[PDB]
């Protein structure tokens with residue numbers, strides 16, 4: 001309700017959003033008639049990227065699995081031809097947000113090989129997952145490394161699971177059980193969580 | 200004991216079974232008594248040799264790398280997979296398979312348990328570093344080859360009683376089961 005559009009948006013010859021209406025209307029127009037959902041997302045982005053520059057609010061652009069935007073798709077036409085990522089309006093409009101041509105906010109993102117298309121299982125580095133196009137787009141950027149648990153974090157994670165009584169095996173509380181969990185997971189948070197799930 | 204036919208060959212005379220038994224019982228009586236050196240060699244004239252050499256795992260030498268760290272190298276084989284492992288005397292429990300961390304090289308939990316079995320058995324998880332190179336075979340065959348290589352290399356840094364225990368737990372035996380034609 002506080003944010004208001006700065007242009008007239010025409011959904012259909014009958015229906016339009018007139019200048020100065022609250023942004024919520026645009027969102028509602030995408031939630032009621034799905035035909036205009038994708039057009040309603042872009043407008044929202046186009047507004048948030050602009051008004052933040054004016055200084056009305058601070059904008060955080062959080063995108064997980066950002067490596068999807070500059071890769072390949074598994075979507076096809078009716079003639080079974082491949083579709084490129086830039087041909088999707090939803091993906092085309094989100095790339096504009098990754099460009100650092102606006103101020104008043106930050107762009108935080110995370111890579112992910114899980115769910116990715118045409119990437120080997122052991123690819124995790126920024127260039128390898130992003131591609132040449134992705135690296136050129138995000139460049140310059142600040143990379144931040146996430147590693148496996150160090151001993152303190154691993155001990156505290158198992159203590160949290162013990163406090164929730166989530167480790168029911170009688171040998172799990174013991175030191176030998178902790179060493180076996182450490183070896184089998186190698187302090188990896190996801191492997192440790194999956195192993196602790198069924199113990 | 201000397202068999203009947205070879206005893207005939209030594210004597211160059213045919214003899215029955217009961218007289219062979221008579222001779223063997225006399226030899227037993229001579230053994231039980233406090234037989235001297237002459238009697239000992241006399242008995243040995245009629246005692247053939249069979250060699251038993253189990254219990255003894257060849258303990259690989261402890262080498263030293265350029266950095267002054269002690270390590271031991273060993274080989275293992277399982278089906279068509281061949282592994283060669285270097286175990287370091289001191290470490291923090293890091294296993295490195297073809298230059299890849301062991302949890303990334305072995306996504307399946309069964310193989311990680313197989314890699315864990317040797318160190319866990321002798322209660323030294325997190326005390327050695329392993330650098331192994333495995334080639335050929337498949338997932339489980341490579342895991343088994345690496346397990347055998349690490350056990351045979353780790354036999355250098357354990358006590359002889361522990362070496363025998365690993366031998367009895369099946370951790371130092373090459374598995375010979377392979378696909379039959």
Ligand SMILES: Nc1nc2c(ncn2[C@@H]2O[C@H](COP(=O)(O)OP(=O)(O)O)[C@@H](O)[C@H]2O)c(=O)[nH]1
Pocket residue numbers: 008009010011038039040041042043044046089093
């Ligand atoms: N139906 C409709 N969609 C609009 C309108 N304005 C913006 N949009 C949507 O919001 C997005 C705005 O992106 P934009 O900055 O204008 O890039 P461009 O259209 O390719 O030049 C567009 O991709 C449209 O999908 C409009 O006046 N009518």
